[PDB]
């Protein structure tokens, strides 16, 4: 009942894995469905994204909630094309189904990859969901003609999605991706120079070890901007009665003395 990790693991485990034949077939169907959909778009003259969306909506069925009017009208127009063209529509349907089946079958690789990123500011389920997004990207961009296995191309995209999500959402005050990478490089360099030096290095050492364009003031500013905020509800003392925010005075509102001074000054 509880513990959503167990529920998600069971739901992924209810889908059997794939062999080479099934994987290659699914990749072929997705690719030919994309080719067929662009062929339909060329024949009808409409936007490819819209026909992709209507085909996907008609496949997903009523169960999944552009309104039904446009989807029905364009579908019926699509079901009006003469022969040798509607075949493309059928191939597009099969390709979309193949894409869904491929993602559903390869979801477990996402969990396997994401299970090694815990303790970095994101919960387990968030890492899995971002890995799923990366898996969707890899499925969409995968090219089977190279005879390579799908997981080899999928792992890179899954890792990219997980890393981007960690860089984007792990901090209360958002720091841009390049600055986050700079902080990580600073930390790595400082750690290596700590181990080597047998003591914590001073800022000049880190500045020298980063390379040209780095001085001690820049290192200090970078470590200052890397500070994370503390909680106003941090417990102080053993008893459950004192919080950190209880010791912070308000400096915005004017004090009674200040207001009286202003009123007397106005008078």
């Amino acid at each position: 009942t509880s513990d959503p990790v167990r529920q998600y693991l069971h739901e992924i485990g209810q889908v059997p894995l794939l062999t080479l034949e099934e994987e290659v077939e699914l990749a072929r169907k997705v690719e030919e469905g994309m080719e067929a959909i662009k062929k339909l778009s060329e024949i009808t003259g409409l936007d490819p994204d819209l026909i992709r969306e209507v085909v996907r909506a008609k496949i997903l069925g009523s169960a999944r909630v552009l309104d039904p009017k446009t989807v029905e009208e364009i579908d019926q127009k699509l079901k009006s094309l003469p022969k040798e063209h509607k075949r493309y529509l059928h191939i597009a349907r099969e390709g979309e189904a193949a894409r869904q089946h491929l993602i559903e079958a390869n979801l477990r690789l996402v969990v396997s990859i994401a299970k090694k990123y815990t303790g970095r500011g994101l919960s387990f389920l968030d890492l899995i969901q971002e890995g799923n997004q990366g898996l969707i990207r890899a499925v969409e961009k995968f090219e089977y003609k190279r005879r390579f296995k799908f997981s080899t191309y999928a792992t890179w995209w899954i890792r990219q999605a997980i890393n981007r999500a960690i860089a984007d959402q792990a901090r209360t005050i958002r720091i841009p991706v390049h600055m986050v990478e700079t902080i990580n490089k600073l930390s790595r360099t400082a750690r290596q120079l700590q181990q080597e030096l047998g003591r914590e290095p001073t800022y000049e050492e880190i500045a020298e070890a980063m390379g040209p364009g780095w001085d001690a003031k820049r290192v200090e500013e970078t470590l200052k901007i890397a500070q994370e905020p503390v909680s106003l509800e941090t417990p102080i003392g053993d008893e459950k009665d004192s919080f950190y925010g209880d010791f912070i005075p308000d400096e915005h509102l004017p004090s009674p003395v200040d207001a009286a001074t202003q009123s007397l000054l106005s008078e």
Binding site: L20, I173, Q227
Partner: protein, 1367 residues
């Protein structure tokens, strides 16, 4: 306009969206470079307002005069920055989410409305099972499916799509069946494969292909990376391709004309579906759902026969319809909201009303409970679908601040992290929906969003609480903010930190008057600083207030004249002194401050008892009432000199203690000598001569001429008190010698000390006759005598003269205690000789009991019990011996005098100091076999010390752990009684209670007159309900019973003239939300009728709660059913040692077997039986008579059973008597009025048994006053009245069931109270004190009462001028 009511109700998505000033679209808080809020973030100035006053973000508009100007370049309105703590935002959820308050508060509102269990609701809301919204003629396992049915994922899919199975085939093994042929269950598809479901079988990835040639065959191998194009059993032509491959050279082109066959399938897919070949364009595409008789292909030549889903396989030019349905089953908050919108409340209400006619009681109760929610929704106007959240409100940023500490670091609230998680998950869900992700991923994301909303609203309720990484601390949700001891209500609304306050250590102030306190100069300067600035401006110390403040800032810049200005500032004003814990109202008192040097507050000795204060490090707080009203209230109502009697018992509370009692007792005691010892003298001259010769002591009780006297009374005869005191000053006689003095026209044989005490009282009260009447001259002055004197002086003269007398007594008691020569030495703990004997006799008898064990006459229990009893009696005898020795040999011993005067000490402690320590308890609770035979003067051994340490530790633990149950009880009583005030002079009732004067004997022998103290506590100050004639004295109706009246009634009762007293009580008052003056009686702190406007509920709660904190079962001494029983009584708890009572009347017949026992109560109509364990003890005998409601065994009576059997008044009497027994056992005096108030609140509600022609439901609990008014209305219109029975509920359940949702929410069970009030749309009318305190209003009590607060005052000149103007 004034605020009079506060309403709480459910919020619609439209209401929430109208609250918001904009939607928060991003989880960003502030920029990492500039520390300004990010656009569309949690701190955006466009949504919540500008950070600076009257200034937009980009600085275009940086001045005022532009109120309401929305910057074109930034979008920031120009207004006060304070709006950042008022303006809300909102988050638009991609999918609806359920408000956890209405899901997890048992019983669930959503579950109760839709008849869904908690497990079923949990399963649906968190995406574990589906719920059907439209069956669409679906069949599951042969049974049609109905609405509101739960399907598992397997059942749902199997029904939505169908059945299929894939069986793999190892290489080299062929399939016995052909592609596209029906296969029945059990039909073997391979030598090691057996199918399970019916339907067509389909080859998957055939390994090899046989292509003939017009004939002769040929084989082609198919690798995994290549597919087959030609359908099974189809001829092929030259140049056509068969096995399409990745490589153009690897493609297989048919050389000649030949048929094609496919063998060695990698797997077989058996599906349950229909087949339909076609030869031209088809009409329905893959993924389409069809019905029977629908067009498939060939322009309608082929038609569908079953419900299912269509796949048009172009390889074999065939449409396959898998048997499925269009069922509309959904999961989650979307489905729950759909069910909620479809609900029609009126029809459901009608179904439940018909359901209320069933003979079953449980079913009827369920229908009533469901109807409660249905009717609450119908009356309030709230829509049920509003319990599902669509737009999440966002708290203003200034209440979830992100502030920079002085060192440049940042501190933030957990709400920011919760909102960030919610926004991130919502955005990811929206992104995933826009990408057409599979349903498993979407289901996971929707579950995560629901959990995020649950954590934001109430973290730590379902599942593991959300914590920040690197810590185990749960994040603090809004529910945590509202509720608890650290929550908003209890920490910031019912109690606050205040200005103009200080604290310091306290020191005794013996030279102070009763109304004065010593305040440090620096503390006073800081406390009265604005007044000092005004006075300094008035004088010439400073030109203006600013310069004065700068002067007072620096210590070295302070001069002499500012102190005189301060002395002028405080003239006539009072301050409030408070010592924690404040157990009763006397924990805060008003005093006139005298400015002193040093840093200690000086406290009057006579208020220390009221404060429970001493001088070993205690600290007290000081507060300054500011306005004229506050000063008048402090000077008139809470001044120390105006509060001399206890509000709980009416006894004096400011009274002599410790040194004062010691000094007065020392001067009022008389010497006794044994030199003469009753000798005989014929003439006084012989006695005088004998005394001069040295044979007779001065104060020896001799007999001369047949009368007892002493040589002192004949030798020394004084004309007046002045002569006796002059002789004392000359050393002729001592204050303790008995002489004869002429005073008040009489010749008194008394000591000069008693005459001096008489002169002290007379000079303090400035009246000789009344003072002579008040004092008891012929007794030593101790605690009780002084208390009686203070009370009598109060009654006869007034508080002002009483305060003067108290001060005089304090001064003279201290003076005479200083010079008395009271000291403690090691020899002052006199050891009696008899103890030695007492010990040897025991060492003798013990041996005998051991002989009693060597011959088998005694068992373990008998020997242990006998040893314990022996040592107990030895300890008692030693105590008596010690005190007899003190009384006979050393009548002035310091310990004896201290205990006898009531100054300090009790007999047990003296016994431990002098006689022996006694038996000790093991940690298991059993006594040891050897006692501690050493006193503290002789010194204990190591083993005895360790043995006593167990009891010492047990006492310490008991104190620390129980004080919180007593505090809890006090809080519960305040919450249940806070609304009761004296609201009128007379309610007009003719009902009353009868106070009894006799009690049944413990052996049922006869009635014995009750103890005087108990009768006093039950009778003093009450209003007589009926006229009384006793001892030729007529007590008229409406007479407040004074102490003399109570004594007269007791004396009349002792003569058999009266047995009971009829009086008014709060139990029978009819005033709404309070009592009346007559039904309450005397204000016990003033000994005069209570004033209208008094908050008597708070006084009652404090009076009950104060003694239990300390004096209940204070330091415990480990030397040889208290509070729990009171808590059990106030909560209407059923006892675990419950007794058995006689429901009816009848005769007793005991039926005894050797294995079982029973008691038959045989009436004239019926005879019932009671089976009880054989070991029990019976209070009745065979052939006895018992009335209804009488007990049949020993033990506590169940109050609910008594209510059912005997009625309401019997339960009120039982509750009052049983609560008073516990307090009497500890020696605490508390008048019955307070307990009666609490019991009246306990017995407030009724339960409907028959609704009659009303809208009420059977079993619906409601207030007795409301149902009485409704019945009166019913009678006026002339219908059938509602039938009800009284209910009894504990204090907690009564307090949580009140009408006011604010007080109940601030008391306890905050989430439940708030959810129920929001569902019902309850309006708080602000009747009680808690609500007005929460809103910061004037409480409707005391000076804020409507009876007194509209009073006007005018002088005669203005009044006559106004009269002339009227004329």
């Amino acid at each position: 306009k004034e605020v009079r009511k506060v309403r709480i109700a459910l919020a619609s998505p439209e209401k929430i969206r109208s609250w918001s000033y904009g939607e928060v679209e991003k989880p960003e808080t502030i920029n990492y470079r500039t520390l300004k809020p990010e656009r569309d973030g949690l701190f955006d100035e466009r949504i919540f307002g500008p950070i600076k006053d009257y200034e937009c973000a980009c600085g275009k508009y940086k001045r005022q005069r532009f109120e309401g100007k929305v910057c074109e370049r930034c979008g920031v309105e120009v207004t006060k920055s304070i709006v950042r703590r008022y303006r809300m935002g909102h988050i638009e959820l991609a999918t609806p989410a359920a408000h956890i308050w209405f899901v997890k508060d048992v019983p669930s509102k959503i579950g109760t409305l839709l008849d869904l269990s908690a497990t079923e609701l949990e399963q649906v809301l968190y995406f574990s099972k589906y719920i059907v919204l439209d069956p669409k003629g679906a069949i599951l396992n042969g049974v049609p499916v109905e609405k509101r049915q739960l399907l598992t994922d397997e059942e749902y899919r199997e029904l939505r799509y169908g059945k299929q199975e894939t069986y793999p085939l190892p290489p080299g093994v062929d399939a016995l069946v052909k592609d596209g042929e029906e296969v029945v269950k059990g039909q073997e598809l391979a030598p090691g494969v057996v199918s399970r479901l019916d339907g067509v079988a389909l080859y998957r990835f055939p390994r090899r292909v046989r292509v003939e040639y017009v004939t002769e065959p040929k084989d082609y191998r198919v690798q995994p990376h290549m597919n087959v194009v030609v359908p099974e059993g189809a001829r092929v032509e030259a140049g056509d391709k068969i096995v399409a491959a990745i490589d153009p050279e690897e493609e297989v082109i048919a050389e000649a004309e030949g048929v094609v066959h496919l063998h060695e399938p990698a797997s077989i897919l058996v599906v349950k579906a229909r087949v339909y070949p076609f030869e031209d364009d088809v009409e329905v595409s893959t993924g389409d759902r069809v019905a029977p008789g629908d067009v498939l292909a060939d322009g309608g030549k082929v038609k569908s026969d079953v419900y299912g889903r269509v796949e048009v396989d172009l390889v074999r030019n065939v449409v396959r319809v898998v048997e499925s349905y269009d069922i509309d089953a959904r999961m989650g908050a979307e489905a729950i909201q759909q069910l909620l919108k479809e609900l029609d409340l009126e029809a459901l209400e009608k179904e439940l009303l018909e359901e209320m006619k069933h003979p079953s009681r449980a079913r009827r109760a369920k229908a009533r409970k469901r109807l409660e929610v249905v009717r609450a929704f119908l009356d309030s106007g709230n829509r049920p679908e509003w319990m599902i959240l669509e737009a999440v409100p966002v708290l203003p940023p200034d209440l979830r601040p992100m502030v920079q500490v002085d060192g440049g670091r940042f501190a933030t609230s957990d709400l920011n992290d919760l909102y960030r998680r919610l926004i991130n998950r919502n955005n990811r869900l929206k992104k995933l929906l826009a990408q057409g992700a599979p349903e498993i991923i979407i289901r996971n994301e929707k579950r995560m969003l629901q959990e995020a909303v649950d954590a934001l609203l109430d973290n730590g309720r379902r599942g593991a609480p959300v914590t920040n990484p690197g810590s185990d601390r749960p994040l603090r949700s809004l529910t945590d903010i509202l509720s608890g001891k650290q929550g908003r209500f209890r920490q910031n609304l019912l109690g606050k930190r205040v200005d103009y306050s200080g604290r310091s250590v306290i020191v005794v102030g013996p030279q102070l008057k009763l109304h004065q306190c010593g305040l440090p100069k620096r503390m006073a300067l800081e406390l009265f600083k604005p007044f000092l600035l005004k006075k300094m401006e008035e004088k010439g110390i400073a030109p203006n207030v600013k310069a004065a403040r700068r002067m007072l800032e620096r210590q070295r810049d302070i001069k002499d004249e500012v102190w005189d200005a301060l002395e002028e500032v405080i003239h006539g004003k009072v301050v409030l002194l408070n010592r924690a814990p404040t157990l009763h109202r006397l924990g805060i008192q008003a005093f006139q401050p005298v400015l002193v040097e040093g840093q200690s507050i000086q406290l009057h000795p006579l208020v220390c008892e009221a404060f429970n204060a001493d001088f070993d490090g205690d600290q007290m707080a000081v507060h300054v009432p500011l306005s004229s009203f506050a000063q008048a209230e402090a000077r008139i109502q809470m001044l120390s000199a105006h509060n001399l009697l206890s509000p709980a018992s009416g006894e004096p509370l400011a009274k002599p203690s410790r040194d004062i009692i010691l000094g007065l007792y020392y001067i009022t005691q008389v010497r006794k000598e044994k030199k003469g010892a009753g000798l005989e003298f014929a003439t006084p001259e012989e006695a005088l001569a004998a005394h001069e010769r040295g044979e007779v002591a001065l104060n020896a009780p001799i007999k001369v001429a047949g009368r007892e006297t002493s040589v002192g009374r004949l030798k020394y005869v004084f004309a007046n008190p002045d002569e006796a005191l002059l002789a004392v000053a000359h050393g002729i006689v001592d204050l303790q010698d008995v002489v004869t003095v002429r005073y008040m026209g009489k010749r008194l044989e008394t000591s000069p000390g008693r005459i001096l005490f008489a002169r002290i009282v007379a000079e303090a009260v400035e009246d000789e006759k009344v003072a002579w009447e008040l004092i008891q001259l012929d007794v030593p002055q101790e605690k009780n005598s002084l208390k009686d004197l203070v009370y009598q002086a109060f009654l006869r003269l007034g508080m002002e003269k009483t305060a003067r007398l108290l001060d005089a007594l304090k001064y003279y008691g201290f003076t005479f205690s200083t010079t008395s020569g009271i000291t403690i030495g090691i020899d002052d703990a006199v050891i009696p000789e008899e103890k030695k004997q007492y010990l040897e006799e025991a060492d003798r008898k013990l041996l005998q009991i051991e002989q009693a064990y060597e011959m088998g006459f005694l068992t373990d229990r008998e020997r242990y019990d006998q040893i314990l009893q022996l040592w107990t009696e030895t300890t008692e005898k030693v105590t008596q011996a010690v005190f007899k020795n003190f009384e006979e040999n050393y009548p002035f011993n310091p310990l004896y005098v201290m205990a006898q005067s009531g100054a300090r000490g009790n007999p047990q402690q003296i016994r431990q100091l002098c006689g022996l320590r006694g038996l000790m308890q093991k940690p298991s609770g059993e006594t040891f076999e050897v006692p501690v035979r050493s006193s503290f003067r002789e010194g204990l051994t190591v083993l005895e010390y360790f043995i006593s340490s167990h009891g010492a530790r047990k006492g310490g633990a008991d104190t620390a752990l129980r004080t919180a149950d007593s505090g809890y009880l006090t809080r519960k009583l305040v919450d249940v009684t806070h609304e009761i005030v004296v609201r009128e002079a007379d309610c007009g009732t003719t009902n009353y209670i009868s106070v009894p004067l006799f009690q049944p004997d413990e052996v049922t022998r006869s009635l014995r007159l009750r103890k005087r103290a108990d009768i006093e506590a039950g009778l003093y100050g009450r209003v007589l309900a009926r006229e009384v004639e006793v001892l030729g004295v007529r007590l008229e109706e409406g007479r407040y019973l004074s102490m003399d009246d109570v004594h007269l009634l007791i004396k009349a009762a002792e003569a058999g003239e009266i047995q009971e007293v009829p009086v008014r009580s709060p139990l029978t008052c009819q005033t709404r939300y309070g009592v009346c003056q007559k039904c309450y009686g005397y204000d016990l702190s003033m000994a005069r009728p209570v004033s209208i406007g008094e908050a008597v509920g708070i006084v009652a709660a404090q009076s009950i709660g104060e003694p239990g904190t300390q004096l209940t079962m204070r330091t415990f001494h480990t030397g040889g059913q208290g509070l729990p029983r009171v808590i059990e009584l106030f909560e209407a708890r059923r006892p675990k040692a419950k007794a058995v009572i006689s429901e009816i009347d009848g005769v007793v017949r005991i039926e005894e077997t050797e294995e079982k026992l029973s008691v038959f109560v045989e009436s004239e109509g019926f005879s019932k039986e009671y089976k009880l364990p054989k070991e029990a003890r019976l209070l009745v005998k065979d052939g006895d008579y018992v009335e209804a409601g009488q007990p049949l065994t020993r033990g506590a009576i169940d109050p609910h059973q008594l209510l059912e059997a005997k009625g309401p008044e019997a339960v009120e009497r039982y509750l009052v008597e049983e609560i008073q027994k516990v307090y009497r056992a500890q020696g605490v005096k508390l008048h019955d009025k307070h307990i009666e108030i609490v019991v009246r609140q306990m017995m407030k509600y009724v339960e409907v048994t028959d609704p009659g022609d009303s809208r009420l439901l059977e079993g619906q609990v409601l207030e007795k006053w409301d149902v009485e008014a409704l019945n009166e209305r019913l009678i006026a219109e002339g219908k059938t009245p509602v039938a009800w029975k009284p209910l009894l509920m504990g204090v907690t359940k009564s307090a949580l069931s009140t009408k006011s949702w604010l007080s109940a929410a601030s008391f306890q069970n905050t989430t439940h109270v708030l959810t129920e009030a929001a569902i019902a749309g309850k309006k708080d009318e602000l009747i009680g004190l808690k609500e007005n305190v929460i809103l910061g209003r004037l409480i409707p009590a005391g000076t804020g009462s409507d009876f007194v607060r509209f009073t006007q005052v005018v002088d005669q000149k203005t009044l006559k001028a106004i009269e002339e103007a009227r004329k």
